[PDB]
Amino acid sequence: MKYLPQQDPQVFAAIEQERKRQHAKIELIASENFVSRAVMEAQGSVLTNKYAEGYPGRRYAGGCEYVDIVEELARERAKQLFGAEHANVQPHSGAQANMAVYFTVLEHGDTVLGMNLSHGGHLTHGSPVNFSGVQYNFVAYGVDPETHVIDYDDVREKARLHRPKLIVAAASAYPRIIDFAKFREIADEVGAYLMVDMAHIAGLVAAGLHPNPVPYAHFVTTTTHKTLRGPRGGMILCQEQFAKQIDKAIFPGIQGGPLMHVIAAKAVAFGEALQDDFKAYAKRVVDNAKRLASALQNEGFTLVSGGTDNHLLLVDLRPQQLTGKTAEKVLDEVGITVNKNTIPYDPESPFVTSGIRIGTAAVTTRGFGLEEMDEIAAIIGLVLKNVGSEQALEEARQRVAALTD
Amino acid sequence: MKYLPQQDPQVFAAIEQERKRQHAKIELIASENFVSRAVMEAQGSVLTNKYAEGYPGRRYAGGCEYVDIVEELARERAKQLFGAEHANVQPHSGAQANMAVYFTVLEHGDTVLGMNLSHGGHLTHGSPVNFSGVQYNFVAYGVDPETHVIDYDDVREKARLHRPKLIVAAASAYPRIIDFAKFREIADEVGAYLMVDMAHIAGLVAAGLHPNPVPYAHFVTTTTHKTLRGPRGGMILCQEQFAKQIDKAIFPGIQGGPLMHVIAAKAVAFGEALQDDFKAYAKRVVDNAKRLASALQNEGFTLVSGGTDNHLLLVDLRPQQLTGKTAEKVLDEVGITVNKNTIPYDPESPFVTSGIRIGTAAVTTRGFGLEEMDEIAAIIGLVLKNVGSEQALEEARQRVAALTD
């Protein structure tokens, strides 16, 4: 940076602290990643200056020739990545992408069927303190109490009983492959639309390491910033038949001017995802998650569903008589960043929890491999088996530092 | 830029075109401005990598120590700028800031009173194709047919007849000072909340050149990117009594993770706005608008309301027998960027219109003064009085180029 340090010492000092934090810590928050310098440069561009309400070639202002090229690059690359008939790259966030789809096909008070929030579903899939649960009548399907895999007979039964207008598949904390074919079969049986929120798994889908929801879903929503390793924002994919309605839902429906600089960054990230090396990266993410899962089990930990098919895992801390809150706090003390997370059928509140959620996307981007996964697991074991030993925690601290340099 | 040119030639080429466009054209779109290099650097920072759901000191994840400092800098500087008891700097946009306030105090189908959209009101103030008009029952107050000033007796009558739960004051195309005291008096009479959407005038308010709505309104919403000259995003200001509800409306209500890098950029912009030189800038914006208004009248143009009190003016093109659409198109041909805009009691559709909206915030940032305003007015006169003369348009083109170098 050149201008920020002189203009705003306070903001610059804090940013520098954050930059150094990102390097020093072992980042295991499943929703996080590290974007490229190219992506950041696009976000830091003059495109922030341009109002571009509407869409490429159909804007409500002149002078959009070049931001049009940028948005179309984003849309076409997204279509190439996911095989979608239509892309909308304007959503400000995952929340807004979901909001727009709901706005498209639902009326106030319509019934929607989504994944149980304490079993892996997201806030925007029907929380009573979120617009989704306030605006629409959400009902939930669960995972099996033993296998922690989605119970598709429960999905079907809930669908047949409640007759939802829309079924939502996908999750913020589900470590296994989701069967989109089964979701569509159930949706077809009850005459419901299917929406897949692939936010967490989007990069894995792009790399062919998780089945693609696009051929099965009427709408696919995603964030651009998780496994897709892009800027912070949202996106909607759908078939041509819903293109006009989806676009109108985003504008003039729920948003105003798009963030053109972020859209540029989206294009950049999509370009990166189209490369062969991204596919290799995504395989390492999944490989690392499996290795970390196995290594954690070797340390004596129980995992929700008994492992992982994707980038993330959930540790069930009940055998260690620890809450997620306790584990999260003590791991923070040694430089390992996780989040407390409800496990299926958790006896604790979502504010305490019996689990921690861990993902490998960020550490993989930093170049961590299988050996590092073993060491991360060993450090977690050392910490969680010795929460009352400051000497153990100091050793963990040093081993964390050894990993990040 | 260093990394983007090598990584993504296509995106870089388009960005460079846009950068050169921004320099070459005379930008008169009233909602636009040019941000500082410091603001852009903040947006291009590693803060995009951080999930920070929740609020400073009350986050739902660890590792937020430094993004907390950043967000608090944004909040405190905003409070210093506007004298507000509480700030929420997380809204992704003006649309989302408004959405959150509506979410806070209104139930589905509640009556809201806002400015007539064809008289100056915004899309998010009740358009039937916007969430606001779909989710809530919007009624409208108008401006006087002769003076084009808000008819406060009409505001009062509509309020007393329809009994709104909420009254919205502020506009996207109103060239005069809004009387917030009168809006509050009317709101008090009917037991309605008052929300002021100061998006367009926020910078002028910060500089003491437009009355501050904060002491009169329960909620004040704004964008950060218009006269405030900040990054693209939204903000909510309110008294302490609504702080908790407003914060909960943004998260977990309507959004998810905030854009921390944009919030950093917000802090930077607020820092800039606190400086003496910003106040001088804002005075030049208003001075330039008055001068441009007077110079346009000297060229024979009629202005909505007969002039301006702020950064923007509306030309009523009816005396020239031109539509806003026609004027917008031909000005584009010579390098002057405006938007077609409905005038009060427009005989034309919002897609054709009888006016053009012009603002001086962007050209003032570029260092344009009174002499440049005279020349801009003269060029507009030359163009709009000779729409069928290619020689006239070429002269205009050359005079535009002379202004921007």
Q: Which residues pair with B88 in a beta bridge?
A: B236
Distance CA A394, CA A147 (A): 36
Amino acid identity of residue A264, one-letter, is A
Which phi and psi angles does B166 have, rounded to 5°? -140, 140
Biggest CA–CA distance in chain B, Å, is 65
B152 membership: H or E segment, kind and range:
helix B152-162
- Chain A residue with CA closest to B97: the answer is A255
B53 a catalytic residue:
yes
Nearest-by-Cβ selection for A63 from B6, B70, B337: B337
**Two tokens at A261?**
């600089």
In sequence order, what E strands does B94-189 have? Answer: 111-115, 137-141, 166-169
Which phi and psi angles does B235 have, rounded to 5°? -160, 150
**Å between B218 CA and nearest CA of chain A:** 22
Query: Cβ–Cβ of A95/B255 closer than 8 Å?
Result: yes
Given resolution (angstroms): 1.7
Cβ neighbors of A338 (< 8 A, separation 6 or more) are A28, A29, A327, A328, A331, A356, A357, A358
Query: Cβ–Cβ of B3/A36 closer than 8 Å?
Result: yes
Query: Cβ–Cβ of A35/B49 closer than 8 Å?
Result: yes
Nearest-by-Cβ selection for A256 from B3, B124, B257: B124
Q: Which residues pair with A236 in a beta bridge?
A: A88, A221
Query: Cβ–Cβ of B94/A256 closer than 8 Å?
Result: yes
Burial of B332 (0-12, 13-18, 19+ CB in 10 A): middle
- Chain A residue with CA closest to B361: the answer is A49
Distance CA A318, CA A327 (A): 11
- Chain B residue with CA closest to A97: the answer is B255
Binding residues of A for pyridoxal 5'-phosphate: 51, 93-95, 122, 172, 200, 225, 257
Distance CA A196, CA B186 (A): 47
- Cα atoms in the 13 Å half-sphere on the side-chain side of B340: 23
Would you say A17 and B66 are in contact if contact means Cβ atoms under 8 Å apart?
Answer: yes
For residue A353, give Cα distances in angstroms to A53, A208, A314, A334. Answer: 43, 33, 11, 21
Would you say B33 and B365 are in contact if contact means Cβ atoms under 8 Å apart?
Answer: yes
**Two tokens at A193?**
């639309």
Domains and CATH numbers, chain B: 1-32+284-405 (3.90.1150.10), 33-283 (3.40.640.10)
User: What string of DSSP letters covers B55-106?
Assistant: ETTEESSS--HHHHHHHHHHHHHHHHHH--SEEE---SSHHHHHHHHHHHH-
B222 a catalytic residue:
no
End-to-end CA distance of chain A: 23
Residues of chain B contacting A58 with CB distance shorter than 8 Å:
none
Q: Which residues pair with A196 in a beta bridge?
A: A169, A220
Instruction: Indicate the pairing of strand A193-197 with strand A111-115.
Output: unpaired
Cβ neighbors of B187 (< 8 A, separation 6 or more) are B159, B167, B193, B194
Residue B215: Cβ within 10 Å count: 14
**Å between A49 CA and nearest CA of chain B:** 6
Query: Cβ–Cβ of B62/A131 closer than 8 Å?
Result: no
Distance CA A38, CA A23 (A): 18
| Catalytic annotation, pick one of B77, B165, B226, B340 | B226
B66 a catalytic residue:
no
What per-residue string of b and e applies to A2-16 under the rule 16 or more CB within 10 Å gives b? ebbeebbeebbebbb
Instruction: Indicate the pairing of strand B355-359 with strand B312-316.
Output: antiparallel
Q: SS3 of B193, please?
A: strand
Would you say A139 and A162 are in contact if contact means Cβ atoms under 8 Å apart?
Answer: yes
Supply the DSSP symbol for A213.
Answer: S
Nearest-by-Cβ selection for B254 from A67, A108, A131: A131
Q: Which residue in this structure is represented by tokens 């409208």? A: B140
Give the A:B interface size as CB pairs under 8 Å. Answer: 273
Would you say B268 and B39 are in contact if contact means Cβ atoms under 8 Å apart?
Answer: yes
Secondary structure string (H, E, C) spanning A11-34? HHHHHHHHHHHHHHCEECCCCCCC
Distance CA A107, CA A122 (A): 21
Residues of A known to be catalytic: 51, 53, 197, 223, 226, 232
- Chain A residue with CA closest to B357: the answer is A61
Method: X-ray
| Catalytic annotation, pick one of B232, B279, B366, B397 | B232
Query: Cβ–Cβ of A94/B256 closer than 8 Å?
Result: yes
Query: Hey, of B2, B4, B197, which one would you mutate to test binding to chain A, going by the most A CBs within 10 A of its CB?
Result: B4
Residues of chain B contacting A103 with CB distance shorter than 8 Å:
131
Query: Cβ–Cβ of B11/A271 closer than 8 Å?
Result: yes
Nearest-by-Cβ selection for A41 from B4, B67, B124: B4
Distance CA A181, CA B250 (A): 35
Distance CA A281, CA A366 (A): 10
User: What string of DSSP letters covers B356-370?
Assistant: EEEE-HHHHHTT--H
Distance CA A364, CA B229 (A): 38
- Chain B residue with CA closest to A327: the answer is B62
End-to-end CA distance of chain B: 23
Residues of chain B contacting A69 with CB distance shorter than 8 Å:
10, 14, 17
- Cα atoms in the 13 Å half-sphere on the side-chain side of B126: 26
